[PDB]
C-alpha cells in the first residue's frame, strides 16, 4: 500500500516481462524500466523506506533477498544472480552493504 498504486505497478508489470528470462536482470535497465529513475529523489527515498523493512540503515544482501517481494509476491529476489546484478551496480563502493544514498545515486541515473 504505497508504490503499487502510484505508478510503479505498470512499470513492474513491464519489468516482469522485459526481464522474464533467467540471469537477464540488468540494474540500470531495471531502474529505468521500473520507473524508479523517472521518480524524483523524494519518491525514490520513500520507496527505499518501504524496502528496508528492518529499518537497520543499510540494504544488506539478505534483506535485498526480499527487495521486490514487497511489490510482487513472485519477484526475482530468490535468484541470487539477478539480485547480485542489482547489488553490483547499486553498490557504488565495492563493499556490498548498500546505503539509501548509494541506491538514490544509482536510481537517480
Ligand atoms: Ca536494512
Ligand atoms: Ca556500499
UniProtKB/Swiss-Prot annotation:
Annotated positions of the N-acetylserine modification: 2
Superkingdom of origin organism: Eukaryota
Keywords for this protein: Acetylation, Calcium, Metal-binding, Repeat
InterPro entries according to UniProt: EF-hand-dom_pair, EF_Hand_1_Ca_BS, EF_hand_dom, Parvalbumin
Identification of the protein by name: Oncomodulin-1
Keyword Repeat: yes
Entries under PANTHER family matching the protein: ONCOMODULIN-2-RELATED, PARVALBUMIN ALPHA
Any one Gene Ontology cellular component term annotated for this protein: cytoplasm
Sequence positions that bind Ca(2+) 2: 91, 93, 95, 97, 102
Similarity field: Belongs to the parvalbumin family.
EF-hand domain residues: 39-74, 78-109
SUPFAM superfamilies: EF-hand (SSF47473)
Pfam (any one): EF-hand_7
Residues binding Ca(2+) 1: 52, 54, 56, 58, 63
Entry's Gene Ontology molecular function annotations: calcium ion binding
Record function comment: Has some calmodulin-like activity with respect to enzyme activation and growth regulation. Binds two calcium ions.
Keyword Repeat: yes
Gene3D superfamilies: EF-hand
Amino acid at each position: 500500500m504505497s508504490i503499487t498504486d502510484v505508478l510503479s505497478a505498470d512499470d513492474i508489470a513491464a519489468a516482469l516481462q522485459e526481464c522474464r528470462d533467467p540471469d537477464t536482470f540488468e540494474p540500470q535497465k531495471f531502474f529505468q524500466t521500473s520507473g524508479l529513475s523517472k521518480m524524483s529523489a523524494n519518491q525514490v527515498k520513500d520507496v527505499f523506506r518501504f524496502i528496508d523493512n528492518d529499518q537497520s540503515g543499510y540494504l544488506d544482501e539478505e534483506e535485498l533477498k526480499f527487495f521486490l517481494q514487497k511489490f510482487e509476491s513472485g519477484a526475482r529476489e530468490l535468484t541470487e544472480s539477478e539480485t547480485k546484478s542489482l547489488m553490483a551496480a547499486a553498490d557504488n563502493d565495492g563493499d556490498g552493504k548498500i546505503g539509501a544514498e548509494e541506491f538514490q545515486e544509482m536510481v537517480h541515473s
